[PDB]
């Protein structure tokens, strides 16, 4: 017989191995596959589809369907932003319920860009100008209009285009950022301000709503498969 | 075999890849532990905010390693493993919390009261981290004002380099059941390059 040698590692079962085992059913005719439309290849492709961000997670409005309707009120020109979203995936409760967030709860690292969309749902005739602004990592979330107005920002026109897109880049220190709340490494800050104010024709409801959608970009990737399932 | 001439050495390289500069420092190490909270109580000490100046100088592991050289350039990656728990011995409850972590570029206004304008910052980058998901991550590239970070600066005007400041607070309002949270910060210097090699600091820091 061929002179062999059992090295350390034999008689051990690796839960993440890749060996070939005896097939318990010889010649079983397997029903062939068909093109059922919607084949998926990788998880990072589910994130490439926008999901609606639950902006309002307040006491009464959290868990109800109103956790998506961002209401532009009939209040003054208070520079306090009309919405500030912390672009810190796990260190901020809001971005963790999105599809894009769900996939990021199955890994430890993430790289690439994330894009924000804002579909305005206001009485056709109604107009105005809002200022969607982003403040790069580390820098404190902009509190006054002018402040935000100096960082990366788009002055989105209600009257002209209904849907507003703003792609937040990948201005990161390391090559891979965290998905854990060890430290609050404040990434970006998607911030929306009243540039002008809303102008309404005749007597159309003075408080209409907006929706926000977040998704991954083609350059978005993840690593180190970890998980957390409970009982 | 047993040979002692006086050549140069003997042969040519024999593979040294994992000892290269990039792989020497390619290991993230804790740099600090920032403790926050959401006090319904007026604890003007921990008062939500916690600010830490980004300095390697605090932890030893990363320090000695960086001291083996005099100059360096390094794209800095930060990771934020955020963990929480309730303080008081009570069956009190809470909804998942969202923490805002702010990176502030070197030479900016450092936030004090968790309140103040400097927390809105039209410019300073921030990261809203919802709890219970993969830790947050941002990469701040070589933010030196010079052509390299001076590990040991000789001369006069210690503010070594200034890699910025991190501020973390809870975004949610005052919950009846007070929640403490520790923000661990990890720093993997990437694309690192170094210059003049000094002898290693032997002693205690």
């Amino acid at each position, epitope marked *: 017989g061929l002179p062999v040698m059992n090295t350390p590692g034999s008689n051990q079962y690796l839960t993440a191995d890749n060996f070939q085992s005896p097939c318990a059913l010889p010649e079983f005719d397997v029903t062939p596959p068909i093109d059922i439309p919607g084949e998926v290849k990788n998880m990072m492709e589910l994130a490439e589809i926008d999901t609606m961000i639950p902006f309002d997670l307040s006491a009464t409005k959290k868990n109800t369907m109103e956790m998506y309707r961002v209401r532009l009120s009939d209040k003054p020109h208070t520079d306090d932003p009309i919405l500030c979203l912390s672009l810190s995936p796990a260190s901020d409760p809001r971005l963790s319920h999105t599809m894009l967030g769900e996939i990021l709860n199955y890994y430890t690292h993430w790289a690439g860009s994330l894009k924000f969309t804002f579909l305005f749902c206001g009485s056709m005739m109604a107009t105005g100008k809002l200022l969607v602004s982003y403040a790069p990592p580390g820098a404190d979330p902009p*509190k006054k209009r002018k402040e935000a107005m100096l960082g990366t920002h788009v002055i989105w026109d209600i009257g002209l285009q209904s849907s507003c897109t703003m792609v937040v880049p990948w201005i990161s220190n390391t090559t891979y950022r965290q998905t854990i709340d060890d430290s*609050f490494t404040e990434g970006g800050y998607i911030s929306v301000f009243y540039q002008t104010r809303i102008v309404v024709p005749l007597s159309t409801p003075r408080e209409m709503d907006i929706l926000g959608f977040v998704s991954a970009c083609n350059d978005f990737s993840v690593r180190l498969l970890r998980d957390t399932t409970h009982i | 075999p047993s040979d002692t001439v006086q050549t140069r050495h003997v042969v040519q390289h024999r593979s040294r890849s994992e000892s290269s500069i990039e792989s020497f420092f390619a290991r993230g190490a804790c740099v600090t532990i920032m403790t926050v909270d959401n006090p319904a109580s007026t604890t003007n000490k921990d008062k939500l905010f916690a600010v830490w100046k980004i300095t390697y100088k605090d932890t030893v592991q990363l320090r000695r390693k960086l001291e083996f050289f005099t100059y360096s350039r390094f794209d800095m990656e930060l990771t934020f493993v955020v963990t929480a*728990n309730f303080t008081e011995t009570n069956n009190g409850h809470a909804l998942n919390q969202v*923490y805002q972590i702010m990176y502030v570029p070197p030479g900016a206004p450092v936030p*004090e009261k968790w*309140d103040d304008y400097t927390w809105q910052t039209s410019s300073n980058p921030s990261i809203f981290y919802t709890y219970g998901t993969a830790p947050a991550r941002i990469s701040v590239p070589y933010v030196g004002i010079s052509n390299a970070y001076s590990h040991f600066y000789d001369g006069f005007s210690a503010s070594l380099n200034d890699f910025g400041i991190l501020a973390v607070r809870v975004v949610n309002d005052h919950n009846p059941t007070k929640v403490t949270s520790k923000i661990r910060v990890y720093l993997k210097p990437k694309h690192i390059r170094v210059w003049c090699p000094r002898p290693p600091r032997a002693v205690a820091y």
Partner: nanobody
Amino acid sequence: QVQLQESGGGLVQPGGSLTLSCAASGYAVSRYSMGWFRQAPGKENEGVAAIDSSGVGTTYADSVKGRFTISRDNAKDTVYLRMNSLKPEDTAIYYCASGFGLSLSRYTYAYWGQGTQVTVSS
């Protein structure tokens, strides 16, 4: 999981000067601004008071202003809202939240309080 326990909520009578308090779990106060919102009976939520303990930047509502005082601790990590000269309209259910922020706005907030009603009725 960040916990904000809303305590100090009880029945006062037109001119009351009660105080509310909330602790900070999972994070350091200065990392998040801190605020309050009231659900007026049968009404939408209104911003009341909000400051970030980092450098303490005070901001109040139009009605609320002057009377109420928002203060923050960094040692016990608590927010103390001294609700002075409470009036009949101020008969609402308060909630403490951490923002970014640094003030009154329906959204812009992360973790929310459970619930507490300060009834301003003689």
